[PDB]
Amino acid sequence: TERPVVNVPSEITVYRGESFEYFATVTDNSNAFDLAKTVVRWLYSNQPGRGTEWLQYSVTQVGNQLKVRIFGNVPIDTTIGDYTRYVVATDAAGNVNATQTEMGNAAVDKTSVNGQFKLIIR
Ligand code: NA
Ligand code: NA
Ligand code: NA
Ligand code: NA
Ligand code: NA
Ligand code: NA
């Protein structure tokens, strides 16, 4: 009950040669966040990820929630396919919606964590 909660589109579809601009939301029972530790990343590191290096995000406080803008410009030559990515949010007290251990276990087991989504390039 102390962890923040992301709502993100389960499948974010982007197209070669086009930009995109999707939104996710974070809520927390404390109403307060660590915006510097709220990120969009691939599994392995706090980075956008190989094959999706153009994936960008921004974090804004709106009232008691976070607005997470997920955006970028997809190069015309980008490789098509499907990638798993993550919105990892931190409340002001340092609680997270998903830990790296939870993320790693889900990736191996083919299960999911809060904030996980599929990024599909067409
Ligand atoms: Na909390
Ligand atoms: Na949801
Ligand atoms: Na839902
Ligand atoms: Na554009
Ligand atoms: Na709240
Ligand atoms: Na961390």
CA distances from 15 to 22, 35, 76, 81 (A): 13, 29, 8, 11
Residues with CB under 5 A from ligand 4 (ion): 19
> How many Å from the N-terminal Cα to the C-terminal Cα in the chain?
38
Output the 3-class SS for 29-87.
Answer: CCCCECHHHCEEECCCCCCCCCCCCCCEEEEEEECCEEEEEEEEECCCCCCCEEEEEEE
What number of other Cβ atoms are within 10 A of residue 75's Cβ?
11
Nearest to 98, CA basis, from 22, 26, 29, 36: 26
What one-character-per-residue DSSP string does 93-122 give? TS-BSS-HHHHHHHHHHT---TTEEEEEE-
Burial class (CB in 10 A: 0-12, 13-18, 19+), 73: exposed
> Number of C-alpha atoms within 13 angstroms, CB side, residue 33?
26
Tokens representing 1 are 């009950």
Distance (Å, whole) CA 33 – CA 10: 23
Domain 1-122 in this protein, CATH class: mainly beta
Give the gyration radius of the chain's Cα atoms: 14
Q: How far is the CA of 75 from the centre of ligand 3 (A)?
A: 31
Q: Method used for this model?
A: X-ray
Q: How far is the CA of 76 from the centre of ligand 2 (A)?
A: 31
Q: How far is the CA of 8 from the centre of ligand 3 (A)?
A: 8
Q: What's the reported resolution, in angstroms, to a tenth? A: 1.3
